C-alpha cells in the first residue's frame, strides 16, 4: 500500500526552474502562511512525509545569474524552523529537514531533532548530508577538507554518537512525581561519554525520547560509499531516477545494500521522485507542462547544470553546440553525467548550450515529468509501484502552493478508491506511517 | 507607556525551582500545545515580547536529573520560537543563540529566517559564555579568555550585521513577466575577513519588514556592559530592589550614550516574579506555597553553578562562615558573599537553607505577592520611579501564572493608560519603539 | 470510568451570580476568542461534553443593572459552531426550544452542526414557556407541551433518518450524486406538527445527535425516560443525588430502554486552591460578590440562592480533595459523570484541567486520551 | 478601488451544475475543513465578503419527485443551515466579511435580530444578513406553513420586519454595557430600552439579549429583482447581489438600483451593487477555453432543465446550457491577465461597484483566483492590498 512524500526547497526553486515565474506561483517562501498551507494540504491528502532540502550558499558556479534570475539556493530559509512552523499547525504529517554532518556537531543535531520530535509528538525525521562543497564552506569559514569517502566514515561515528544521545534518556526516565520530589530517575539518564575518532560528546542529551523513540533517518545515498551508508543507516531513501529501468535498479541495489548491512530490506523505504502536472483533460495537462517548461530561462538551468556537472559552462557562449565543448576540452576530460545527460536530453541531437540548460532546468535532467489527467497520474503511480519502481513517491512541485492543492484534491482520492493508498492515518507517528519498528 | 515581556526556559525550570512540583504546573514543556498556549496568552495580554534562554548541558547528574535541575531538559529555543511564531501575529519572540558554539552564517540565517516567518517580530539574545559542560557536549576544550570572547563577539556582530545587509530593501523584485528574480546589483557579497572569522557569500535570506532582528543582551560583567553599550537594542536585567534597578538602568543608558548611540533606543527590562491572589492574604499563601516547593539541593546546585564554585564538597549542615574559613575570604566569590548577606540578613545560614533561598528566585529576582491592583501599582510605581523601560514577568509556574497575569493585571495597566490596549504596529521594533 | 462535562451560559452568568465581578473573569462572552479558548481547554482536559443553556428573553432594573440571568445571551447554535471549528474530539451541546422553533429547523441545524463537527454534537431539548420569551416571539398547559415534544422528537428523528447511511454516492464518472431510492420523504403529520420533504442534510458519522434533557417535573422525567441519552441534573448532596439518579434510571427502564445507555451528570461547582485554606478563602471571595437582589431575580423567575442556584454544591479544595470528592461521590452512585459549574470564566477551567484532570487520570477513573472520535463513543452509546 | 465577494451554496451546487462531478471538486460540503479553507483563502485574497444563499427544501418541482434532484446534483439536494457555517468560517478568520441568507417568512424578527447580532459580535464586526421573502410550497411543507401572503404584501411585511429588527439592534446602545466589577453595575439600565414593537404584522417586546458589535448593525444584503423588490432594496439594501449576462444589462440594472436607492432618500454610493461572473482560469487562453469546455460538459441535461423549471416556474440541450451558468451568469475563460482585464473594463464602464465570483468548482477555483487574479488587480491599483479597516462596513465604504 504505497507511500507519498512532498519535497521542495524552502525558497525559490526545487527542480522546476520556472516555478517562480509561473502565473500561479505565490512566491510566499519568505512567509509562514505559505509553509503552513502546503503542509496542512499534504496532511489533508494523507501524505506520509514532507521534507526540506538545504544548501548553505547562493550558487555561483558571480551573482548575475543566481540572484538576478531564480537560481538554486538564492533564497534558502533555514529548514529546521520551517519544519517547526509546519509541525505547529499539523498533527499527523511527517516532517523532515536536511542538516549537514560536515558543518554541525552531533550534540546540536541530536538536540535539534529530539526537540522537533517532541514538539511534533513523534513526526520527525533528519536527512543526513555529508557534502563539503566550497561555496558553502566559505560561508561557514571552514577550510579543513576530508575526502568524499572519509566523510561517510566520519558520518558513521556521527550517527552512532547521535543514536547514543537519543538513547541517553530512555522510555520511563522522566517521572513527574511532584509529591515525592522526584523529577527523573537518575540511574535511567546516563552520560554518553562519546570520545572516538572524529567527534567528542560527553554529557547527556537534554531532551527525552518522543513517543516515536528516534527520528526517522533519511538519506539521499547515490555514491558507491553513499549506498553502503544508506545501507547501514537509512530508513527512508530519497532517489531521483528518470525512468522505470533506472528506478528498478536503484531500488534493488538499495535493498541489497540494506540486506548486506544485516538489516530487514522492508524496513528501509525507497522513494523515487516524479513531477506530476495535472489537467482536466490530458490535452490541458500537456499544454500546462509546455507552459511550465517554457518559463525556464536558459542561463539558470545552465547555471545549475554547470554546478551539478562540476564544470563552469559560462566560460562558453550560449550558441556553442555541445560536441564543440567536448572538442575544446578532452572527450575524456569532460564529466560523465554531463555527456550522459546531453545524449539523453537531446535524444542524439547536438544541442546548443542554452538548449541544454533550458532542458536541464525543466526537471534537473533526471526527474520524470508526468503530464496527465488524475486517473492517468494515479494509473502511472500504481503501475510503477506494482512494477517494483519504489516503495513510495516523492512529489516534486511544478509550482507552489497550487500543484499540491491539485494533486491532493484530484489524484489522492483516486489512489484511495483503488485501495493502494491510505484513506485515514492508521497511526500517529511518522514511523507508523512508513511502517518502521521502535 | 511601559513594555511587558515574557521569559521562561523551554524545559523544566526558569527562576522558581519549585515550578515543576507546583499543583497547577502542566509540565507540557516537551509539547507544542504548551508553547502555543503560552505565546498566544501573552499576545492576548498585548506583551511586547517573549524570549527564551538556552543552556547546552544538564548541570554527576544525581541532583540535576533527580530533582528540578538547571538545564535538565532544554529544547532548542529556535524551534520552540518558530512554533510560537506560527500561531501568533503580533507578539515578538526571542531565542538565545551562543556566539561561541555557532558561526556567524548560522545565526544570521536562522534569525533572518524566523524574522521572515514571523513577519518581523524576532529577536536574538546574544550570549558569549563558555561553560565547561557545554564545551564537553560540543567537543571544544581550548577556551578564549572572558574579555576576549566579547572582542570576538564584536567581530561576530559586525559580520552578522553585514549578512543581514547583504540583501537590502527592495532588491527582490518578483518580475515574472520580465523574468527578473532580483537585482544582482542590489545583492552584494559580504567577504568578511577579520581576526577570528571569515564569512563570504551573501546571506540567502532577505530582510524582513523589521529590517534586522532586534538585539537582546544580558549584560552583567564590566566588559559586557561596554558590549551591551554598542550592540544591545533591548536589555534584560535581574536587580532585587529599586536602588540597583535605577543603578543598572542609568548605567546601561550611560554605556549606550558613551558608544555614540541614543539611550532612548535601548529599552532596559528588569525581571519581577509576581504571584497573584484575589486578596493580599491569598497572594501571600500562594507565594509561601511556591517557595515551599524548592528542594534545598536543587537551589544549591544552581547557586554552586552561578557562584563559580562547587558546594557539594561540604555537607548540607555546613554553615557559611566555616566555608569562608575552609576557603579564604579572598578566595571565595563575592556574588556569594553578597547573596548570603542579603538572603540571610546577616544570619550565618546552613548551606541547605542558603541554596533553598537561592532556588526561590535566583537570589536576585523580586518576588511580588499582590492582588492585581497591587501588582499594577508596584509595576507602575517602579516604572514611574525609573527602575526600567519595562518588565520581565518571570513565571512562578506554567502555563497558569501567565493566564492569571493576562486576565487580571494587564487590563488594569490598560485602564490606567500605562500599557497598550491594541498593538499599534506589527513589528517588534514598533512595539519597543525602535527604528528601521 | 466516569464522564466530565462543561456548562455555562453563552453570556454573563451561569450559577455564581457574582462571576462577572471576579478579578479574573475576562467577560469575553461577546467575543469568539472567549469560547474558542474554553472549548479548546475542555478538550485539553479530555472532557466528554461542553454545553450551552439558553433562554429567549432577559422591568430590567435588576437584570440588566446588576449581573442577572440571561442579561446577555448569545444564540447557542452559533457559539457551538465557533467551538466545533477549533476542536476535534470534545462534544458540543446547545439548547433549542421545541415551543418557538419548528421540527425541521431543529433537525437541520443539529444535523448541520453534527456534520460540521464530524459527529460530536448534541441537542438539549426544552419545552418550557416563559412570558418574557413569548412576548419576544410574538405569541398551552405544562404537561401537554411534552405531549407535543413527543411528537416533535419523532419528527426530528424521522428527518434525521430521511437520508440513511451510504445514500450519498458522488459517482462523478457515472453522474449519480445520490441513490434516490435511499433518500426518502418523511410525510410527518401528527397531532400538532406537519413536516414533509426529506431533510436537506445527511447523517453524520454519529448517526444522530445526542439528546440532552433537563428532566425536573413528574412528566419531565417521563420525557427523559423515553428520549434522553444524557441528563443534566442538580442535587445539593449525595442523598438527593442518589435518589434522583435511580429515579431517572428507573424511568428509563420504565420506558423500555437500557438504563446504562442514559448518562446521568450532576452539577458541582469546584473552587480550587493550592492549599485547603486558599480554596476556602477563594470561595469566600466568590460569594462576597453576589448581590442579594440578583439571586432574587433568578429565584423568582435570597442572597444565597445566587451563590450556587441554591442547590449546586460548592466544593472548595486542593485538587487532591476535588479529585477525592469527585471519585467518592461517583463510587457512591451519585451520577455517571459531573457537570463542572464554573466559578468564573475562562479562569476556572484552566485550573480544573491543569490541576484536577491529571489526578483523576492517575487513579485511573477518567480517560487519559480520547478512545473514540464521536460524542456517542465518549458516552458509550450505540449507532 | 472595486470590491470582491465569494458566493456559494453550503451544499452541492451554486450556478455551475456539473461542479460536483468536476475532477478537482472536493465535495467537502459536509465537513468543517472545507468551509474553513474557503473563508481563509478568500481572506488571503483580501475579499470584502463571502455569503451563502439558502434553500429550505430539496427541489422537487421538476418531475414531481426527488428522482432528479437527489439522483443527480439538483438544486438544494444537500444544504447546510448557513448561520452555523458562517460561525465556523468566522472562528478561523479576522477581516473577511460573512453573510447568510435568513427568511422573513419562516423566522420571527427576534430570532433574526439575535442570531445576526450574535454572529456580528463573534466575528467582531464582519457579519451581514441577506434578506429573503420568498414563499415556495416545498419550503412551506417542511415548515408546516399553510398560510400565504401575496408577493408584494410579503415585502410590505418585510418592511415592518426590518423596522423591528433595527429597533432591536438599537435596544442596547454604545457604552450601556459597563463592567464595573468594583461598583457592582453590570450595565446602565437606562441605556437598555425595551422595544415594545406592536405593529400590523408583528409583535416583539423585550430588549435584544445581545449588544451592538463594533459595526453597529449587520450589513443588509438583498437580491432585489422584482418591481417591489427593487423598491425594498432601495429602502434597505446596503449591498445588492445581481445577475446580468452582458454589459448593457449590467449598467442598466446598476443605474436602476441606484435610482431606487436615491428615490428612497438615501445616498446611492452607500449601496454597493455587485454583479456575478464565473471565471475559468488557464495559464494560456487555450487552456482556459479547454477548462471551460470540460466544466460545461459535466452539466447533465435533466439537472439543468430542473433548475430551469424552478427558476422560470414551469415543470418539464436547452437545459444543458442553462446549467452551464444559471442561464445568465457570464462565464469568462481567460488567462488572469485577461480575467483581471475584464474585471477592470467592466468596473470602469459602470457595470457594477463590485464582483461576485461564482465558483466553477470548490475549493479549487478560489485557490486559483486568489493566487493568480487577485495580485494582478492589486498590482494595477484597482483592489485592496491590505484590509484598511476591520469591519465589513469599513471594507464596503459604509457608515455607522
At B10, give phi and psi (nearest 5°): -80, 70
Which helix (H) or strand (E) segment is C168 a member of?
strand C168-171
**Are B244 and B370 a contacting pair, CB within 8 Å?**
no
Is A56's Cβ below 8 Å from some Cβ in B? Answer: yes
* CA separation for the pair B238, A155 (Å, rounded): 43
Name the nearest CA neighbour of A307 among A16, A52, A55, A21: A55
Nearest to C350 among B281, B289, B400 (CB): B400
Task: Flag whether B15 is marked binding.
Answer: no
Nearest to C80 by CA among C115, C51, C109: C51
- In contact, D260 and D230? CB cutoff 8 Å: yes
Strand partners, D279: D332
Answer yes or no: are the C-beta atoms of A316 and A368 closer than 8 Å: no
CB of B18 closer than 8 Å to CB of B293: yes
Name which of C64, C70, C108 is nearest D187 (Cβ-Cβ). C64
Helix, strand, or coil here: B127?
Answer: strand
Cα separation, D249 vs B272, in Å, equals 69
Q: Which helix (H) or strand (E) holds B214?
A: strand B214-217
Q: Which of C153, C118, C2, C9 is nearest to C68 (CA)?
A: C9
Residues 6+ apart with CB under 8 A from D41: D363, D366, D367, D370
Instruction: Name the one residue in this structure whose C-alpha cell is 532577505.
Output: B206
Contact by Cβ (8 Å): D49, D128: yes
> For residue A272, what are the β-bridge partners?
A239, A393
**How far are the Cα atoms of D57, D66, D303, D317 from residue D63, in angstroms, in the given order?**
15, 8, 11, 17
C-alpha span between A366 and A243 (Å, rounded): 9
Q: b/e map of D6-37 (b: 16 or more CB within 10 Å)?
A: bbbbbbbbbbbbbbbbbbbbbbbbbebbbbbb
Q: Are C357 and C367 in contact (CB under 8 A)?
A: no
- Let me know: does D272 contact D354? Beta carbons within 8 Å: yes
Helix axis angle for B351-358 and B296-307, nearest 10°, is 80
The Cα–Cα gap between B375 and B278 comes to 12
* D207 to C175: CB separation less than 8 angstroms, yes or no: no
Residues followed by a break in chain B (C to N exceeding 2.5 Å) are 59
Cell numbers for C20: 462577572
- Contact assignment for C23 to B279 by CB distance below 8 Å: no
Distances (CA, A) of C223 to B159, C97, C142, C144, D349: 77, 15, 13, 12, 64
Q: Which of C23, C285, C351 sits opposite B372 (nearest CB)?
A: C23
The answer to whether D24 contacts A409, with C-beta atoms less than 8 Å apart, is: yes
DSSP letter for A107, please.
H
How many domains in chain B?
A: 1
C238-269 burial string, b = 16+ CB within 10 Å, else e?
Answer: beebbebbebbbebbeebebeeeebbbbbbbb
Tell me how far apart the alpha carbons of residues C336 and D317 are, in angstroms, rounded to a whole number: 62
Q: Residue length, chain B?
A: 436
Three cell numbers written together for B202:
551573501
DSSP E strands: which ranges in B265-304? 267-276
For residues A398 and A23, is the Cβ–Cβ distance under 8 A?
Answer: no
Residue ranges of alpha helices (H) inside chain D are 32-44, 66-71, 82-91, 109-123, 137-143, 151-169, 227-236, 247-263, 285-297, 301-312, 318-324, 337-348, 364-368, 374-379, 392-396
Q: Which residues form the domain of B319? A: 1-436
**Chain D touched by C13 (CB under 8 Å):** no
Rounded Cα gap, residues B122 and B132, in angstroms = 29
Q: Which of A139, A6, D165, D121 is nearest to B103 (CA)?
A: A139
Q: CB D106: neighbour CB atoms within 10 A? A: 20
Is B299 in contact with B358 (CB distance < 8 Å)?
A: yes
Angstrom distance (rounded) from CA A239 to CA A268: 13
Beta-carbon separation of C347 and B403 below 8 A:
yes
Interior angle at CA A176, CA A175 and CA A182, nearest 5:
75
3-class SS of residue C194? strand
Q: For chain B, what is the total number of helices (H) and then of strands (E)?
A: 15, 11
What is the SS3 string spanning D265-313? CCCHHHCEEEEEEEEEECCCHHHHHHHHHHHHHCCCHHHHHHHHHHHHC
For residue D391, report the phi and psi dihedrals to the nearest 5 degrees. -125, 155
Q: How far apart are CA A246 and CA C187, in angstroms?
A: 65
CB environment C318-335: b (16+ within 10 A), e (fewer): bbebbbebbbebbeeebb
User: H/E element holding B122?
Assistant: strand B122-127
For residue C190, give the DSSP letter: -
Please tell me what DSSP assigns to residue B399.
B
How was this structure determined? It was done by X-ray
DSSP summary character for residue B193: E
DSSP string over A178-222 = TTTTBSS-STTS----EE-SS-EE-SPPSS---TTSSPEEEE---
Q: Is the peptide bond before C101 cis (omega within 30 degrees of 0)?
A: no
| CA gap B92, B50 in Å, rounded | 6
Cβ neighbours for A333, distance < 8 A, ≥ 6 positions apart? none
Query: What is the rounded CA–CA span in Å between residue C100 and residue C127?
Result: 9
CB nearest B75 (choices: A55, A80, A118): A118
* Residue D111 touches partner C, C-beta closer than 8 Å: yes
> What is the distance between the alpha carbons of residues B163 and B203, in angstroms, rounded to a whole number?
5
Distance (Å) of CA A369 to CA A17, A281, A380, C301 = 13, 16, 12, 73
Q: What is the phi-psi region of residue B54: left when phi exceeds 0, alpha when psi lies from -120 to 50, beta otherwise?
A: beta
- Angstrom distance (rounded) from CA A176 to CA B27: 8
C38 touches chain D (CB under 8 A): no
Secondary-structure breakdown of chain C: helix, strand, coil percentages, each rounded to the nearest 5? 40, 15, 45
Q: Rounded distance, CA D25 to CA B406, Å?
A: 44
For cell 561576530, name the residue.
Answer: B156
Angstroms from C26 CA to nearest CA on chain B = 6
Q: Where are the beta strands (DSSP E) in chain D?
A: 3-7, 49-52, 97-103, 127-132, 177-180, 185-187, 197-198, 203-204, 219-222, 239-242, 272-281, 331-334, 354-357
Cell of A55: 544548501
Neighbours of chain B (3+ CB pairs under 8 A): A, C
Distance in Å from the first CA to the final CA of chain D: 21
Residue with cell 507565594: B287
Q: Do B20 and A176 make contact, defined as CB atoms within 8 angstroms? A: yes
Resolution attained, angstroms: 2.8
Element spanning A273, H or E: strand A269-278
- Cβ count within 10 A of residue B189: 16
With an 8 Å Cβ cutoff, is C339 touching chain D? no
Separation of alpha carbons D50 and D97, rounded Å = 6
Question: Hey, of C20, C22, C343, C354, which one would you mutate to test binding to chain B, going by the most B CBs within 10 A of its CB?
Answer: C354
Q: How far apart are CA C135 and CA C128, in angstroms?
A: 14
User: Nearest CA to CA, how far is C300 from chain D (Å)?
Assistant: 18
Cα–Cα nearest to B160, from A113, A141, A131, A144: A141
What does the alpha-carbon distance between residue D322 and residue D245 come to, in Å, rounded to a whole number? 12
Identify the bridge partners of residue C233 per DSSP, sorted by sequence position: C266
Bridge partners for D365 per DSSP: none
Instruction: Count the alpha carbons within 13 Å of D213 in the hemisphere toward its beta carbon.
Output: 27
CATH number of the domain that residue A176 is part of: 3.20.20.30
Residues of A in contact with D26 (CB under 8 A): 409
Neighbours of B230 (CB within 10 A): 18
Residue B299 CA: distances (Å) to CA of A373, B14, B396: 66, 12, 15
Residue A238 has phi, psi (to 5 degrees) of -95, 120
Measured between beta carbons, the chain B residues lying within 8 angstroms of A121 are: 31-32
Residue B53, helix vs strand vs coil:
coil
Contacts of C275 in chain B (CB under 8 A): 285, 289
Query: How many CA atoms lie within 13 Å of A425's alpha carbon, on the beta-carbon side?
Result: 23
Residues D28 and D25: their CA atoms lie apart, in Å, by 8
Instruction: Give backbone dihedrals phi and psi of C206, rounded to 5 degrees, phi first.
Output: -75, -25
All cell numbers assigned to C240: 438527593
User: Does any CB of chain D come closer than 8 Å to the CB of residue C194?
Assistant: yes
B53 near B394, Cβ under 8 Å? no
* Phi then psi dihedrals of residue B361, to 5 deg: -105, -150
Phi, psi of B192 (to 5 degrees): -75, 135
Element of type H or E holding C269: strand C263-272
Among A33, A23, A74, A36, which residue's Cα sits nearest to residue A307?
Answer: A74
Q: Which chain A residue's Cα is nearest to D368?
A: A24
Q: CB–CB of A211/A429 below 8 Å?
A: yes
Q: Which residue has the cell 435570597?
A: C302
What contacts D119, CB < 8 A, 6 or more positions away? C78, D83, D86, D87, D90, D98, D100, D127, D218
Closest residue by Cα to residue B219 from B204, B205, B207, B236: B236
Closest CA to B133 of B79, B71, B81: B71
Q: Where are the alpha helices (DSSP H) in B57-141?
A: 77-85, 104-117, 132-135
D115 vs C contacts (CB less than 8 Å):
75, 77-78
**Which grid coordinates belong to C154?**
419523532
Whole-angstrom distance, CA of residue A382 vs CA of residue C380: 40
Q: Which of D77, D122, D215 to mutate to test the interface with C (most CBs of C within 10 A)?
A: D122
Length of chain D: 400
Burial of D170 (0-12, 13-18, 19+ CB in 10 A): middle
CA dihedral A106→A111→A116→A122, nearest 10 degrees, is 90
Q: Is C77 marked as a binding-site residue?
A: no
What is the rounded CA–CA span in Å between residue C341 and residue C358? 19
Q: In the numeric block, which cell numbers belong to residue B50?
A: 517573549
Q: In angstroms, what CA-CA distances link A354 with A7, A142, A359, A364?
A: 27, 34, 9, 15
Could you say which DSSP state residue A437 is in? -
CA D34 to chain C, closest CA, distance in angstroms equals 9
Give the largest CA-CA distance in chain C.
Answer: 71
Touching subunits for chain A (3+ Cβ pairs under 8 A): B, D
Nearest to A138 among B23, B69, B201 (CB): B201
* Strand A49-52 with A3-7, pairing: parallel
Q: Which residues of B308-335 are buried (b: 16+ CB within 10 A; e: fewer)?
A: ebebeeeeeebbbeebbeeeeeeebeee
* Chain B CB within 8 Å of residue A36 CB: yes
Neighbouring residues of C205: CB distance < 8 A, sequence distance ≥ 6: C118, C119, C373, C374
What proportions of chain B, in percent to the nearest 5, are helix, strand and coil? Answer: 40, 15, 45
DSSP string, C90-117: SEEEEEEETTTS-HHHHHHHHHHHHHHT
Residue C285: all three cell numbers together = 471571595
Q: What is each CA distance from B218 to A287, B365, D329, D397, in whole angstroms?
A: 59, 14, 64, 49
Question: How far apart are alpha carbons C127 and A63 in whole angstroms?
Answer: 76
Long-range contacts formed by A20-23: CB under 8 A, 24+ apart:
A20/A70, A20/B174, A20/B176, A20/B181, A21/A70, A21/A295, A21/B176, A21/B179, A22/A291, A22/A292, A22/A295, A22/A398, A22/A399, A22/B176, A22/D283, A23/B176, A23/D283, A23/D335, A23/D336, A23/D372
End-to-end CA distance of chain C: 21
Strand C210-213 versus strand C121-126 pairing type: parallel
Q: Which residue has the cell 517557595?
A: B291
Q: Cα–Cα–Cα angle for B285, B291, B294, nearest 5°?
A: 145
The owner of cell 414551469 is: D314
DSSP, collapsed to helix, strand or coil, labels residue B391 as strand
Distance of alpha carbon D257 from alpha carbon D354, whole angstroms: 14
Element (H, E) at C233: strand C230-233
Instruction: Find cell 453576589 and name the residue.
Output: C290
CA dist A286 and A282 (Å) reads 6
Tell me whether residue C216 is annotated as binding.
Answer: yes
Which chains sit next to C, with 3 or more Cβ pairs under 8 A? B, D
Which among A406, A416, A411 is positioned nearest to A376, based on CA atoms?
A411
Answer whether A57 touches B (CB < 8 Å).
Answer: yes
* CA separation for the pair C69, C18 (Å, rounded): 11
Q: Where are the beta strands (DSSP E) in B238-371?
A: 267-276, 367-370
Buried b (16+ CB within 10 A) or exposed e, A375-388: ebbbebbbebbeee
Amino acid at each position: 500500500q504505497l507511500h507519498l512524500a512532498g519535497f521542495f526547497s524552502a525558497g525559490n526553486v526545487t527542480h522546476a526552474h520556472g516555478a517562480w515565474r509561473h502565473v500561479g506561483a505565490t512566491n510566499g517562501f519568505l512567509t509562514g502562511e505559505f509553509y503552513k498551507q502546503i503542509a496542512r494540504t499534504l496532511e489533508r491528502g494523507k501524505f506520509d512525509l514532507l521534507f526540506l532540502p538545504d544548501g548553505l550558499a547562493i550558487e555561483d558556479s558571480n551573482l548575475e545569474t543566481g540572484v538576478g534570475l531564480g537560481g538554486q539556493g538564492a533564497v534558502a530559509l533555514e529548514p529546521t524552523s520551517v519544519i517547526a512552523t509546519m509541525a505547529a499547525v499539523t498533527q499527523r504529517l511527517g516532517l523532515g529537514a536536511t542538516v549537514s554532518t560536515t558543518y554541525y556537531p552531533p550534540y546540536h543535531v541530536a538536540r535539534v531533532f529530539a526537540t522537533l520530535d517532541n514538539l511534533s509528538d513523534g513526526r520527525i525525521s533528519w536527512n543526513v548530508v555529508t557534502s563539503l562543497n566550497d561555496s558553502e564552506a566559505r560561508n561557514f569559514g571552514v577550510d579543513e577538507h576530508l575526502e568524499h569517502d572519509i566523510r561517510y566514515d566520519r558520518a558513521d561515528e556521527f550517527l552512532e554518537a547521535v543514536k547514543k544521545l537519543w538513547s541517553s534518556w530512555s522510555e520511563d526516565a522522566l517521572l513527574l512525581d511532584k509529591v515525592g520530589g522526584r523529577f527523573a530517575d537518575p540511574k535511567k539518564v546516563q552520560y554518553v561519554n562519546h570520545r572516538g575518532r572524529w567527534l567528542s560528546v560527553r554529557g547527556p542529551l537534554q531532551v527525552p525520547r518522543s513517543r516515536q523513540g528516534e527520528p526517522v533517518i533519511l538519506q539521499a545515498g547515490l555514491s558507491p560509499r553513499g549506498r553502503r551508508f544508506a545501507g547501514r543507516w537509512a530508513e527512508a531513501v530519497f532517489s531521483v531516477s528518470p525512468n522505470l529501468d533506472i528506478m528498478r535498479a536503484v531500488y534493488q541495489d538499495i535493498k541489497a545494500h540494506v540486506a548486506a548491512a544485516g538489516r530487514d530490506p522492508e524496513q528501509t523505504k525507497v522513494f523515487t521522485a516524479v513531477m506530476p502536472v495535472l489537467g482536466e483533460t490530458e490535452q490541458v495537462a500537456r499544454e500546462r507542462l509546455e507552459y511550465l517548461n517554457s518559463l525556464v530561462h536558459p542561463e539558470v538551468g545552465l547555471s545549475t547544470l554547470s554546478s551539478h556537472s562540476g564544470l563552469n559552462l559560462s566560460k562558453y557562449p550560449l550558441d556553442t553546440k555541445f560536441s564543440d565543448i567536448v572538442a575544446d576540452l578532452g572527450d575524456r576530460h569532460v564529466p560523465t553525467m554531463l555527456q550522459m545527460f546531453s545524449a539523453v536530453a537531446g535524444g542524439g541531437a547536438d544541442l546548443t548550450l542554452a538548449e541544454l540548460g533550458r532542458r536541464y532546468g525543466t526537471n534537473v535532467g533526471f526527474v520524470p515529468q508526468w503530464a496527465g489527467t488524475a486517473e492517468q497520474i494515479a494509473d502511472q503511480l500504481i503501475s510503477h509501484f506494482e512494477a517494483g519502481a519504489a516503495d513510495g513517491f516523492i512529489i516534486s512541485p511544478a509550482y507552489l502552493p497550487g500543484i499540491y492543492e491539485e494533486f491532493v484534491d484530484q489524484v489522492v482520492p483516486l489512489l484511495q478508491q483503488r485501495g493502494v493508498f491510505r484513506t485515514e492515518y492508521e497511526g500517529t507517528t511518522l514511523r507508523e506511517h512508513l511502517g518502521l519498528a521502535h
